[PDB]
Design an enzyme around this catalytic site. Structure first.
Site, PDB file in Angstrom:
ATOM      1  N   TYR A 145      58.227  28.228 -15.221  1.00 53.68           N
ATOM      2  CA  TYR A 145      57.196  29.241 -15.437  1.00 53.68           C
ATOM      3  C   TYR A 145      56.499  29.657 -14.142  1.00 53.68           C
ATOM      4  O   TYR A 145      56.434  30.847 -13.818  1.00 53.68           O
ATOM      5  CB  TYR A 145      56.158  28.727 -16.437  1.00 53.68           C
ATOM      6  CG  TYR A 145      55.028  29.703 -16.673  1.00 53.68           C
ATOM      7  CD1 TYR A 145      55.200  30.822 -17.494  1.00 53.68           C
ATOM      8  CD2 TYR A 145      53.800  29.519 -16.046  1.00 53.68           C
ATOM      9  CE1 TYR A 145      54.151  31.744 -17.680  1.00 53.68           C
ATOM     10  CE2 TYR A 145      52.756  30.421 -16.223  1.00 53.68           C
ATOM     11  CZ  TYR A 145      52.942  31.528 -17.040  1.00 53.68           C
ATOM     12  OH  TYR A 145      51.901  32.405 -17.214  1.00 53.68           O
ATOM     13  N   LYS A 161      56.727  33.128 -11.784  1.00 54.87           N
ATOM     14  CA  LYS A 161      55.535  33.922 -11.488  1.00 54.87           C
ATOM     15  C   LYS A 161      55.398  34.114  -9.980  1.00 54.87           C
ATOM     16  O   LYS A 161      55.097  35.215  -9.517  1.00 54.87           O
ATOM     17  CB  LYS A 161      54.265  33.263 -12.043  1.00 54.87           C
ATOM     18  CG  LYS A 161      54.160  33.284 -13.575  1.00 54.87           C
ATOM     19  CD  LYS A 161      54.372  34.699 -14.132  1.00 54.87           C
ATOM     20  CE  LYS A 161      53.939  34.795 -15.587  1.00 54.87           C
ATOM     21  NZ  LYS A 161      54.186  36.171 -16.144  1.00 54.87           N
TER      22      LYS A 161
HETATM   23  N1  LIG Z   1      48.280  32.990 -22.492  1.00 56.83           N
HETATM   24  C1  LIG Z   1      47.834  32.255 -21.403  1.00 56.83           C
HETATM   25  O1  LIG Z   1      47.152  31.314 -21.558  1.00 56.83           O
HETATM   26  C2  LIG Z   1      48.269  32.731 -20.045  1.00 56.83           C
HETATM   27  C3  LIG Z   1      49.072  33.895 -19.918  1.00 56.83           C
HETATM   28  N2  LIG Z   1      49.426  34.366 -18.584  1.00 56.83           N
HETATM   29  C4  LIG Z   1      50.283  35.535 -18.368  1.00 56.83           C
HETATM   30  O2  LIG Z   1      49.635  36.719 -18.862  1.00 56.83           O
HETATM   31  C5  LIG Z   1      50.632  37.660 -19.365  1.00 56.83           C
HETATM   32  C6  LIG Z   1      50.146  38.073 -20.716  1.00 56.83           C
HETATM   33  O3  LIG Z   1      50.017  36.925 -21.524  1.00 56.83           O
HETATM   34  P1  LIG Z   1      49.607  37.005 -23.054  1.00 56.83           P
HETATM   35  O4  LIG Z   1      48.688  38.121 -23.304  1.00 56.83           O
HETATM   36  O5  LIG Z   1      49.131  35.677 -23.538  1.00 56.83           O
HETATM   37  O6  LIG Z   1      51.015  37.346 -23.705  1.00 56.83           O
HETATM   38  P2  LIG Z   1      51.458  37.784 -25.184  1.00 56.83           P
HETATM   39  O7  LIG Z   1      52.532  36.922 -25.722  1.00 56.83           O
HETATM   40  O8  LIG Z   1      50.296  38.012 -26.046  1.00 56.83           O
HETATM   41  O9  LIG Z   1      52.007  39.248 -24.910  1.00 56.83           O
HETATM   42  C7  LIG Z   1      53.254  39.339 -24.289  1.00 56.83           C
HETATM   43  C8  LIG Z   1      53.792  40.799 -24.027  1.00 56.83           C
HETATM   44  O10 LIG Z   1      55.072  40.916 -23.409  1.00 56.83           O
HETATM   45  C9  LIG Z   1      55.921  41.681 -24.249  1.00 56.83           C
HETATM   46  N3  LIG Z   1      57.254  41.088 -24.305  1.00 56.83           N
HETATM   47  C10 LIG Z   1      57.624  39.751 -24.464  1.00 56.83           C
HETATM   48  N4  LIG Z   1      58.915  39.597 -24.509  1.00 56.83           N
HETATM   49  C11 LIG Z   1      59.417  40.874 -24.375  1.00 56.83           C
HETATM   50  C12 LIG Z   1      60.734  41.386 -24.359  1.00 56.83           C
HETATM   51  N5  LIG Z   1      61.787  40.598 -24.503  1.00 56.83           N
HETATM   52  N6  LIG Z   1      60.898  42.731 -24.204  1.00 56.83           N
HETATM   53  C13 LIG Z   1      59.826  43.546 -24.066  1.00 56.83           C
HETATM   54  N7  LIG Z   1      58.548  43.145 -24.078  1.00 56.83           N
HETATM   55  C14 LIG Z   1      58.417  41.788 -24.235  1.00 56.83           C
HETATM   56  C15 LIG Z   1      55.303  41.558 -25.607  1.00 56.83           C
HETATM   57  O11 LIG Z   1      55.812  42.572 -26.505  1.00 56.83           O
HETATM   58  P3  LIG Z   1      56.054  42.324 -28.083  1.00 56.83           P
HETATM   59  O12 LIG Z   1      54.741  42.357 -28.781  1.00 56.83           O
HETATM   60  O13 LIG Z   1      56.962  43.433 -28.388  1.00 56.83           O
HETATM   61  O14 LIG Z   1      56.723  41.011 -28.154  1.00 56.83           O
HETATM   62  C16 LIG Z   1      53.865  41.626 -25.305  1.00 56.83           C
HETATM   63  O15 LIG Z   1      53.442  43.000 -25.041  1.00 56.83           O
HETATM   64  C17 LIG Z   1      51.941  36.887 -19.306  1.00 56.83           C
HETATM   65  O16 LIG Z   1      52.673  37.356 -18.164  1.00 56.83           O
HETATM   66  C18 LIG Z   1      51.543  35.385 -19.175  1.00 56.83           C
HETATM   67  O17 LIG Z   1      52.557  34.647 -18.521  1.00 56.83           O
HETATM   68  C19 LIG Z   1      48.697  33.879 -17.406  1.00 56.83           C
HETATM   69  C20 LIG Z   1      47.865  32.727 -17.556  1.00 56.83           C
HETATM   70  C21 LIG Z   1      47.772  32.070 -18.836  1.00 56.83           C
END
Ligand SMILES: NC(=O)C1=CN([C@@H]2O[C@H](COP(=O)(O)OP(=O)(O)OC[C@H]3O[C@@H](n4cnc5c(N)ncnc54)[C@H](OP(=O)(O)O)[C@@H]3O)[C@@H](O)[C@H]2O)C=CC1
Ligand SMILES: NC(=O)C1=CN([C@@H]2O[C@H](COP(=O)(O)OP(=O)(O)OC[C@H]3O[C@@H](n4cnc5c(N)ncnc54)[C@H](OP(=O)(O)O)[C@@H]3O)[C@@H](O)[C@H]2O)C=CC1
Lengths: 231, 231
Positions: B139, B143
């Site tokens: 992961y 990043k």
């Molecule tokens: N959650 C946490 O605690 C942390 C999160 N992050 C980073 O922040 C970012 C956002 O996280 P978070 O809001 O929790 O994520 P979510 O899981 O809530 O949202 C993920 C997004 O990516 C899209 N996505 C995932 N897989 C695909 C795919 N195969 N094709 C197209 N779109 C895809 C999703 O679309 P769909 O709805 O269509 O699946 C959605 O819009 C990420 O990069 C994460 O690594 C950073 C620190 C911590």
């Protein structure tokens, strides 16, 4: 399907419900689900302040604003409800040690006492995984103590819920779960379910349980059971 | 007040924005805040599926449904926007190891490349605390790698955000914070801010930063800075 049948039967019973802690995060989800499912014919909130709402269904929700330090003077607010849910709670950081006991034990127990005197038949208490009146940790000691004190009131049905840490907005399947799990070691994808649970799952377990016909006088659901029933 | 002035000046610039990941939890909060603040004159979502909305303000939001495996064929979706925000991300548990790299590195980098070619002047990437291209943890390695690859595109302004684990619904001041903190030991009431941050705070930091006049070509905000700016 079978659950659908239980819900229909329950709606035909014309039951009323009161909620403590509806302004909280678990309480607001509980209220929302109660309205979305239409399980009760009357919904009453009891708390320290009047709440303002968005959607239309909230227009029929009754609110009783009370002073918890003089709760006996608001005994009428607890009169006649069939079911009660308590989601009240504070922390040492916000209220100090004595203030925490005052809310989580004193206010909750007093409310339960007034509910029992008011005719409540099913009281539901939101406690915590690890609750133990013998614990050296203030939070868990108080949760264990209040669970026991409410048990003494002998409601026709008393349900205690012991969820793990409450999650929200699908945290259990988002990247944060991977980060937290990896921090703890090389673990299975189902590790998180042992120590946490989504708040919506807790509420669904509470409402799926409320429509089951009364059986045992006291029911205590640990985190695993909550995950299973809140499916 | 000074921030209010920056926002007014920014609205007068008639800027357009595109968002990747608006369906996600951070992305949906980012979109909501963008509409509540009215910072942009045009809002475009780019993603794998069409989204359906509630409130009226969403009626003016443009949606470009694309196939990320053939993104070049949807280059027009990236044309003409001034600012871009990327909140895309998956996990190994949901997509497998290769699938995770495909989304978090490949789709994100390709999108950034098309945005740069499309005229985007300010690209914002949601990364993670601990990002390090040399990490042995998949992961964080990915990043760190994608942060570096997007830096190579040389946007006029490139902002990277490295939040700790994302919280929601005031988890930082609810009983769960006390339980988690106590599990880790005898710690200060501000311990949690070092390893976590509310999603709304992250979004506020992103939008408070977007209205500041461009200075350095690359900006990287760690968790503490996010807490400070997202006040
Ligand atoms: N959650 C946490 O605690 C942390 C999160 N992050 C980073 O922040 C970012 C956002 O996280 P978070 O809001 O929790 O994520 P979510 O899981 O809530 O949202 C993920 C997004 O990516 C899209 N996505 C995932 N897989 C695909 C795919 N195969 N094709 C197209 N779109 C895809 C999703 O679309 P769909 O709805 O269509 O699946 C959605 O819009 C990420 O990069 C994460 O690594 C950073 C620190 C911590
Ligand atoms: N959050 C977690 O991770 C876990 C929580 N729990 C337990 O679940 C219950 C609900 O938790 P949660 O939803 O997170 O709590 P919240 O902080 O979201 O809600 C707390 C509720 O208690 C009320 N309250 C607090 N202090 C007072 C007071 N002095 N006088 C009157 N009312 C008061 C609040 O009212 P107001 O809005 O007016 O302040 C609010 O309705 C608690 O008992 C908690 O210990 C169990 C496991 C884990």
């Amino acid at each position: 399907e079978a659950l659908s049948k239980l819900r229909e039967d329950f709606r035909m019973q014309n039951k009323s419900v009161f909620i403590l802690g509806a302004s909280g995060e678990t309480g607001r989800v509980l209220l929302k689900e109660i309205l979305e499912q239409g399980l009760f014919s009357k919904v009453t909130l009891i708390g320290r302040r009047k709440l303002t709402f968005d959607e239309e269904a909230y227009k029929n929700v009754n609110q009783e604003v009370v002073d918890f330090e003089k709760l006996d003077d608001y005994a009428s607010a607890f009169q006649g409800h069939d079911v009660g849910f308590c989601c009240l709670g504070t922390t040492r950081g916000k209220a100090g040690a004595e203030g925490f006991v005052r809310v989580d034990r004193d206010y909750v127990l007093k409310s339960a006492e007034l509910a029992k005197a008011g005719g409540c038949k099913h009281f539901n208490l939101l406690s915590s995984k690890g609750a133990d009146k013998s614990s050296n940790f203030l939070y868990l000691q108080v949760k264990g103590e209040v669970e026991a004190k409410v048990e003494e009131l002998k409601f026709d049905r008393y349900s205690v819920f012991r969820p793990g840490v409450l999650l929200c907005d699908r945290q259990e399947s988002r990247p944060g779960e991977w980060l937290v799990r990896k921090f703890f070691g090389s673990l299975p994808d189902s590790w998180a379910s042992g120590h946490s649970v989504p708040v919506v799952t807790v509420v669904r377990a509470m409402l799926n349980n409320v429509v089951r016909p009364r059986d045992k006088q006291m029911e205590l659901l640990e985190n695993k059971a909550i995950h299973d029933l809140g499916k």
